[PDB]
Amino acid sequence: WVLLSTVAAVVLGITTGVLVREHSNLSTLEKFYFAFPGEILMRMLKLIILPLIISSMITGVAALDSNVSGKIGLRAVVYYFATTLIAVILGIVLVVSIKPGVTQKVGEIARTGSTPEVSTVDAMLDLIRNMFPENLVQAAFQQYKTKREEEYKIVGMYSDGINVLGLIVFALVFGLVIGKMGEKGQILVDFFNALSDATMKIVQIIMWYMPLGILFLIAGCIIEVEDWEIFRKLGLYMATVLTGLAIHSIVILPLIYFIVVRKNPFRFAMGMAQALLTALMISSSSATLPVTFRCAEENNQVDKRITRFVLPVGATINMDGTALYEAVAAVFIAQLNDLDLGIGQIITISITATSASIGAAGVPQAGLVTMVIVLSAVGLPAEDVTLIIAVDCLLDRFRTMVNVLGDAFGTGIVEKLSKKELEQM
Ligand code: NA
Ligand code: NA
């Protein structure tokens, strides 16, 4: 009933959403109140991130030996990097071959939204700063950001938004320490094992409300969009983005899973359908993590030791979907400006696009912030990001699904590559 209700909710939500806007006329305030049931689900899933991330990372690392944990972590990191690179290369090839921007002009495309003010050096240094928060309690709900102020002086401040990067790094180090302690640290292992189990049970309670929240979540966004002809001007740009995401999700990732794990990848992906559908509706890899936990464990029979480690980390640093999107968007913006891109310029977009949304799964405008960095790398104005924000919300839905799908396949791949370790213990 859990999966069926989710499918029923989207159909009713899409049916309700299209009918409401086509027949009824709603103001901006009336549109916001319509999506309120979905909004409640959004903050019920966000409420679970902190307890889930902390107890999963501590419990997963603490359960394994130091060497076993290191090898499992090394395998996951290689898979994260390997798949993100392939996603970027696929985006580069598709956008270069399809040439979405060479068939269009800058003037014709409408400009929407505001381009964020980003410093490439400060944004990347902020990544390392957030890995090591100054306060653990503050990191639970706030993040650090630095701005250049004046001959220039760096001023930093904390803003609302959970620092998943800092919490995961501490939870990994904390899990390693309490595991080595043994009997001394057993009480902490037991405490965070119960907290992890309790958090999963609370997710089960949230799943009861998810169908009703999903209905209004999908319905609301369909009603939010006031203009549909804007999607037609960027259709070629959208087509290449979804073509790359579809190929990565349906060809590349299943192929990698099959080679490492001699099993049907679509059977594995079928078990994740509930998590993939949730990601497609909430546009957050961290908020959909609790759903990914159940699908990987309950449906795909993936080891809980592997899942507790790979999934929380993957939701934070594994963004194949976003990395592909930045590579396609950056080259597309380059083509609009009639800017020929050489091998040197193409390469730098690849490395810059790789470091996309490394601490912003669910953070809004996370893709625009990265796009500014990627565009600035090869010298295009950061104001060209305004040409993409029109359809960024829709693409964000599909980005998150591919971001979550990469994590799910990583658990199966890492589990197979560490089979000797799990049996050895
Ligand atoms: Na990846
Ligand atoms: Na991810």
Curated annotation (Swiss-Prot):
GO terms for biological process: adult behavior; behavioral fear response; blood vessel morphogenesis; brain development; cellular response to ammonium ion; cellular response to bisphenol A; cellular response to cocaine; cellular response to mercury ion. L-aspartate binds at residues 283, 285, 322, 363, 399-400, 403. Expressed in all tissues tested including liver, muscle, testis, ovary, retinoblastoma cell line, neurons and brain (in which there was dense expression in substantia nigra, red nucleus, hippocampus and in cerebral cortical layers). SUPFAM superfamilies: Proton glutamate symport protein. It is found in: Cell membrane; Apical cell membrane; Synapse, Synaptosome; Early endosome membrane. Residues 65-75, 182-190, 261-265, 297-305 are cytoplasmic. Residues 21-43, 97-157, 219-238, 333-345, 380-392 are extracellular. It catalyses: K(+)(in) + L-glutamate(out) + 3 Na(+)(out) + H(+)(out) = K(+)(out) + L-glutamate(in) + 3 Na(+)(in) + H(+)(in); K(+)(in) + L-aspartate(out) + 3 Na(+)(out) + H(+)(out) = K(+)(out) + L-aspartate(in) + 3 Na(+)(in) + H(+)(in); D-aspartate(out) + K(+)(in) + 3 Na(+)(out) + H(+)(out) = D-aspartate(in) + K(+)(out) + 3 Na(+)(in) + H(+)(in); K(+)(in) + L-cysteine(out) + 3 Na(+)(out) + H(+)(out) = K(+)(out) + L-cysteine(in) + 3 Na(+)(in) + H(+)(in). It comes from the Eukaryota. GO terms for molecular function: chloride transmembrane transporter activity; cysteine transmembrane transporter activity; D-aspartate transmembrane transporter activity; glutamate:sodium symporter activity; high-affinity L-glutamate transmembrane transporter activity; identical protein binding; L-aspartate transmembrane transporter activity; L-glutamate transmembrane transporter activity. One of its GO terms (cellular component) is axon terminus. Glycans are attached at residue 25. Contains eight transmembrane regions plus two helical hairpins that dip into the membrane. These helical hairpin structures play an important role in the transport process. The first enters the membrane from the cytoplasmic side, the second one from the extracellular side. During the transport cycle, the regions involved in amino acid transport, and especially the helical hairpins, move vertically by about 15-18 Angstroms, alternating between exposure to the aqueous phase and reinsertion in the lipid bilayer. In contrast, the regions involved in trimerization do not move. Homotrimer. Interacts with ARL6IP5. Interacts with RTN2 (via N-terminus); the interaction promotes cell surface expression of SLC1A1. Interacts with SORCS2; this interaction is important for normal expression at the cell membrane. It is linked to Dicarboxylic aminoaciduria: An autosomal recessive disorder characterized by abnormal excretion of urinary glutamate and aspartate, resulting from the incomplete reabsorption of anionic amino acids from the glomerular filtrate in the kidney. It can be associated with intellectual disability. Schizophrenia 18: A complex, multifactorial psychotic disorder or group of disorders characterized by disturbances in the form and content of thought (e.g. delusions, hallucinations), in mood (e.g. inappropriate affect), in sense of self and relationship to the external world (e.g. loss of ego boundaries, withdrawal), and in behavior (e.g bizarre or apparently purposeless behavior). Although it affects emotions, it is distinguished from mood disorders in which such disturbances are primary. Belongs to the dicarboxylate/amino acid:cation symporter (DAACS) (TC 2.A.23) family. SLC1A1 subfamily. This is Excitatory amino acid transporter 3. It comes from Homo sapiens (Human).
